[PDB]
Amino acid sequence: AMTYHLDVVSAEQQMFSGLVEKIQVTGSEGELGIYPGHAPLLTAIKPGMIRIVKQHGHEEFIYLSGGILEVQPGNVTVLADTAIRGQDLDEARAMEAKRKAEEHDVDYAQASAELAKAIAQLRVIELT
């Protein structure tokens, strides 16, 4: 009892790692207060602050854009999103990627020729 190991990480970085007495975070279905001994759980969380009561009572807050909360024997891992995710938001991002590409099949022979040429130019640079 008393403490469990918590990891809070996003696809880009390690945000928190260490023993904690508990965490408070908003789950997709409700509020969550995870203490040592909590049963295995997998759920999405909502954007918002995660309240971490670190070992020795020190409180710490971290704003999360959302993500997944995974509880298993011992370790708790918050897999955080780096940005607020959702169907419409993601789609908005997809539209831009598409529009950028639409602003402006495949001649393999020409492609090879162009690469052969580029290679040739590097060789020149090499030989100074």
Added chain:
Amino acid sequence: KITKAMEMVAASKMRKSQDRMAASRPYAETMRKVIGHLAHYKHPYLEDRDVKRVGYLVVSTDRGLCGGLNINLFKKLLAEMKTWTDKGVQCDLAMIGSKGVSFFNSVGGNVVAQVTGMGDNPSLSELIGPVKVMLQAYDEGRLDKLYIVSNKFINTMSQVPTISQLLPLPKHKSWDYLYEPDPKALLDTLLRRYVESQVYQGVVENLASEQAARMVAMK
């Protein structure tokens, strides 16, 4: 004194790229293990099906003076695309980086989405869109394979052009999770996050490769 300065500047950037690579692992590896738990109704991303069209997320640099980093990768990708198109299998390309965009606009190719100009600071958020276009096409039966094309980082003198399969996805605990709302919804989200993660890792690794190649070119 000037080559030593040249090296200090490059080492500072390389350490940054190496930290990004290392900091990106935990999220991807934890996700992969959770997916393993849940994957053990079969989700489309977990099974093979007849291949009519294939998709590539291609990572090229945004800047020059990197020797043949892009060239060698493009060469490897074209060889694979042709073997597919020779068989009547169409290829869609999601382009990451300026060099790749200019190369394919020139030689043809179906670039359905792109993101350029991330340079030394790539991010997951800038990859959500490009990735989403390909995931959706797979969800819609418009792609039957999705690959990542990028350079694997080894050391300041060695990088390897690589094409890996992302979709479909390439003993057990005594306990099981309480799933909120249910395992199906959750598994679908984890699979999307995992693929996005792998694309992000491909990008940061390519950048590590780029910086290494440039210092060599800077010579």
